[PDB]
Amino acid sequence: RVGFFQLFRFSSSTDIWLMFVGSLCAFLHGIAQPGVLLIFGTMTDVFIDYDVELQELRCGLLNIESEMIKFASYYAGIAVAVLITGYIQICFWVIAAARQIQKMRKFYFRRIMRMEIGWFDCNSVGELNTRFSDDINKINDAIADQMALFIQRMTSTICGFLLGFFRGWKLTLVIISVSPLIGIGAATIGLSVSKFTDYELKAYAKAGVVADEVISSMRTVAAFGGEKREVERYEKNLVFAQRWGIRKGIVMGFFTGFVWCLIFLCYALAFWYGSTPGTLVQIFLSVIVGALNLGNASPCLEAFATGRAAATSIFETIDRKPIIDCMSEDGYKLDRIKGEIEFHNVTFHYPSRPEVKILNDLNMVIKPGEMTALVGPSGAGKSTALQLIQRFYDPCEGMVTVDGHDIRSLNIQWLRDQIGIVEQEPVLFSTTIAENIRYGREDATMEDIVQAAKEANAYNFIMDLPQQFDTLVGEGGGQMSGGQKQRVAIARALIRNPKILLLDMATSALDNESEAMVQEVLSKIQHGHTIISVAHRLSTVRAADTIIGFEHGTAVEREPAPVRRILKFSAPEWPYMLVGSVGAAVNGTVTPLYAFLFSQILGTEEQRSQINGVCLLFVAMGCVSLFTQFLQGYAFAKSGELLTKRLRKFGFRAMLGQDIAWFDDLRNSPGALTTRLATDASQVQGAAGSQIGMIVNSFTNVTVAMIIAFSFSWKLSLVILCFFPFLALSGATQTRMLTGFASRDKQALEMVGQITNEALSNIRTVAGIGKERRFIEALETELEKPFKTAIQKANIYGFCFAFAQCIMFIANSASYRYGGYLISNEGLHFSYVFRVISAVVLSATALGRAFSYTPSYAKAKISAARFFQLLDRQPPISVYNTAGEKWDNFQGKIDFVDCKFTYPSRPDSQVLNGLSVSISPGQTLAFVGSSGCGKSTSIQLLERFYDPDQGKVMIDGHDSKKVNVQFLRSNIGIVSQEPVLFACSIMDNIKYGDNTKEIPMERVIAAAKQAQLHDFVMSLPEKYETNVGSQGSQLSRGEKQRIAIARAIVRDPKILLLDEATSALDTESEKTVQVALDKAREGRTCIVIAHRLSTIQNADIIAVMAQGVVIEKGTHEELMAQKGAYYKLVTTG
Ligand SMILES: Nc1ncnc2c1ncn2[C@@H]1O[C@H](COP(=O)(O)OP(=O)(O)OP(=O)(O)O)[C@@H](O)[C@H]1O
Ligand SMILES: CC(C)CCC[C@@H](C)[C@H]1CC[C@H]2[C@@H]3CC=C4C[C@@H](O)CC[C@]4(C)[C@H]3CC[C@]12C
Ligand SMILES: CC(C)CCC[C@@H](C)[C@H]1CC[C@H]2[C@@H]3CC=C4C[C@@H](O)CC[C@]4(C)[C@H]3CC[C@]12C
Ligand SMILES: CC(C)CCC[C@@H](C)[C@H]1CC[C@H]2[C@@H]3CC=C4C[C@@H](O)CC[C@]4(C)[C@H]3CC[C@]12C
């Protein structure tokens, strides 16, 4: 745990001043209650003197009406002071914490974006997102207003017992004798809670990785039907976190019960050993003041310990010093850079797998102003060489040089500025195309972007879009074709006009014609550029000034009722709310009942009967409180824990059942959904935990107090009851102004999560373009939006909290004035009635602090409304729907009958302008065409990700809209265009091919052998159990593709869909994979999409697609005889 006073590292002078003033006001508000104790003690002696003079009837000197007019004036002054002090106390403390938390978040995100690339290989994005969302929120909970409330309660407790020292002495000695026992207990309990919080936070962080990966790879999850297992993993992570919250609630519910018992038993000990009426009453009331105000301090200690744990978690990251510092200025920068790069005996190991030597004494020379082609098998280390030039890592031994200068002695920012890179399988950011291209150079005008698109061969298809250059590419570029994404990435790298170009397979997803068009300009710009391209095409390899071959590391040349819904939702927790409510009601009854009883025991001496009766009352009120406070604090915490895990599980389950179109909406980005999952459950828990116990306690206390008050004098009680409707008005008015704020803040909070996930998951791309500052500024500019509303919520909360206590004290002032009227004018023996009524009303003053539960009530209502809006949605394509046609014998016959389709996110241009094709069972169809003509769109129709608008897709003579989604998907095996893996072992990534059953390892090994993958996995430490990293990023692209092929093959599907399954492989491995795939596609229907036309000549049918329409259809020989578009496509390549 961190030091508690170390939570204020970010506090400035203004924060210190605010804390000082708020603490002074809290101290005054705390001493306000011993003042009312003194006033109550003074009135009793006056009554005793008046009663004795009446019953003896110094006569006529004292008049009760004037005396209690003075007392009412005292109470009114106390009310005004309490209003002022409470408002300032809450407002200043809430404002001070907000600035510190904002600085903490900005520092956290600014430090995270500075770490070296190797740091992210060991630290998941989901864990960082969960930290940023929830741990800083817990730190805020620790230091916002629980600190002010704890200061006030401690002041009241101290002044309550210190009053018994300065007056009515010889009884506080026993309290001093036991005070270390309270202090020692609260320290050990605080230690226990922090340790529990560490496990809770770790389990919650592990739960956020699963959700993030599933939401990012929903398309893969939906294709293989793994929603059930992903929900199971999420529940497994959540159950561990829920179990520790229960123990935290237990240990914090024992603390509250221990305090009451100890105080009351210690006073019972003090009274029995021992042996004016206005001193006994003060002592009796100080007992309950101390016990009640120590009991209510329990929520603050738990908040402090939770904040300490979250703070050590957050603070470890901020104080870390990165090995490779990009924003630092300790480096040299050259002038007139030639661009020559040289490797000198470079040996490299990856920090995640240090037992494997990726580069072994590698030596190359890359002459400036020439084209160098890196060729080699998958896994030879071609991608690692470029990352070393980028200085993402450093060689274990050896030296990388530019123009003869060591890479380690150069300014990092300048070096990465001089480099433009097209990463293998590029990634774009969620914005318009123009902004994505302008991410390279922010000083680029519109004509610069137009020229960049012209060189990237992107101008034509961009201008053929409904929103030219302003089309939204989507999350990661998902709402684009692979070739379009690649060409936009090429335009991004070319707009910088760099000296060094690193094209890692920059034409992988392009057809022959567009690849030739790109390569023409690439060969044209050679005089002023140093170009290094990883390539597989023979045409790319030729016309290259230098060819360098890689082999194993060596290189050689050549909604409407949120509360009612949650009340119906929390039904299975009735037993725990029943016992908790009983405990809270018993707790609320004793506080005014105690005041009533000690008035009876005092009445108006004896060692035998009076002392014993007082002592037994203390023992009973100690033991019963010990049990019932524990019951309340444990049962309500358990109910909250159960409710929040059910909320989280059901939200995750409901998210997975939505259609793919839902996941494509810009309001449903993966970051936003993860932020929804992480935060909306905690907010409902905050209102749904022990706060219901507090509310029940307060309501029962007030009800019992007024019940006893009405049974003595209904005339006086009506005055006090009349003030209560003011409490309902202010509380309802508080939530009314706060729900409007909570609606506007959640949108900003969700959009902040979008920025964090986008930047942290694409850190390699961000470092490649070198736009860390851009994302920092974007996150900062969106973090300020709730910050302006924070001060207004602080003012509203402070005013309502102060006004509640002000009304409580004004009620007593009015009651005193009315009693002054009543006793003098029309009253006999009424002095005792007013005494007991004032006693019970006085003792029912403090528990009206349930107004501090309210400021989170506005948040919980919005969170519940949003949770129930999603839980009720009915997707057009329901994977959870059990209704649909399911026939026994599946044959894999596919028919397209005049299919017309438009993407919902882009409804101004349809991508399938009538598509008619038929594949007989056992045949193979090869889809060929230009980049972006709709080949992948047709595949998504078969998987039922989308439904055709006009037309139908027929499977075995059945319309696809009437076929069961699960049944249809269980018979299809798909290799996506750029496949994504899960952060697990290789065996688990292969075993995902067939969920709902356990695949034996023999079948996994056979599938891996088929995909030409067994030798690579065998040559690794931890064979078949190596973690592949996030999205399979700790592997080469070819190995990831081969794992995907094995995953598709292992399930043995009736229909096999391959969407460019060799785009990352080299020719030598491609031939072996094709030979193995021929057996895979020998007894089943298959659809093949390929820009490599050497792998489709064996296909039964070759259909050429153009703008969503088939133009030619036939075999290889027939299509070459026609000299059509297929012949041109083959010839140009
Ligand atoms: N971040 C990483 N952590 C650990 N190992 C990695 C990481 N990135 C790559 N590797 C490993 O380094 C080796 C070299 O693969 P590399 O990524 O350099 O591909 P490549 O040889 O250029 O091939 P391809 O054509 O498939 O991209 C592989 O064994 C790969 O698993
Ligand atoms: C009136 C009595 C009873 C209570 C007074 C409490 C006040 C004076 C206390 C409570 C919280 C305290 C602050 C807590 C944190 C900070 C930041 C730290 O880096 C230095 C100390 C400093 C600046 C403290 C100054 C004193 C402080 C403001
Ligand atoms: C404007 C605000 C700050 C005024 C607040 C005044 C209050 C807090 C002060 C001012 C006068 C004070 C009272 C003056 C005299 C008596 C009688 C004495 O035997 C017991 C204390 C008692 C009952 C005092 C209690 C506290 C008191 C009521
Ligand atoms: C609108 C809601 C908040 C009701 C407000 C009632 C307030 C304003 C009223 C109710 C009882 C009133 C008090 C009753 C008796 C006296 C004694 C007199 O010698 C001085 C004024 C003083 C102390 C009054 C001040 C105003 C008072 C406190």
Ligand SMILES: CC(C)CCC[C@@H](C)[C@H]1CC[C@H]2[C@@H]3CC=C4C[C@@H](O)CC[C@]4(C)[C@H]3CC[C@]12C
């Ligand atoms: C079910 C439990 C929790 C209910 C507890 C309510 C208790 C504290 C209340 C409810 C009704 C109350 C009684 C109402 C009327 C009378 C008569 C009066 O001359 C003295 C007080 C006395 C005797 C009250 C004592 C306290 C009392 C019994």
Ligand SMILES: Nc1ncnc2c1ncn2[C@@H]1O[C@H](COP(=O)(O)OP(=O)(O)O)[C@@H](O)[C@H]1O
């Ligand atoms: N989810 C989507 N939302 C909107 N437009 C999309 C989406 N996916 C693809 N597109 C666009 O619609 C067209 C469909 O082409 P696509 O199927 O991606 O091409 P290809 O035939 O190369 O696989 C392209 O213009 C592409 O940019």
Ligand code: VO4
């Ligand atoms: O390279 V494509 O636009 O046919 O996925």
Ligand SMILES: [Mg+2]
């Ligand atoms: Mg590579």
Ligand SMILES: [Mg+2]
């Ligand atoms: Mg595609």
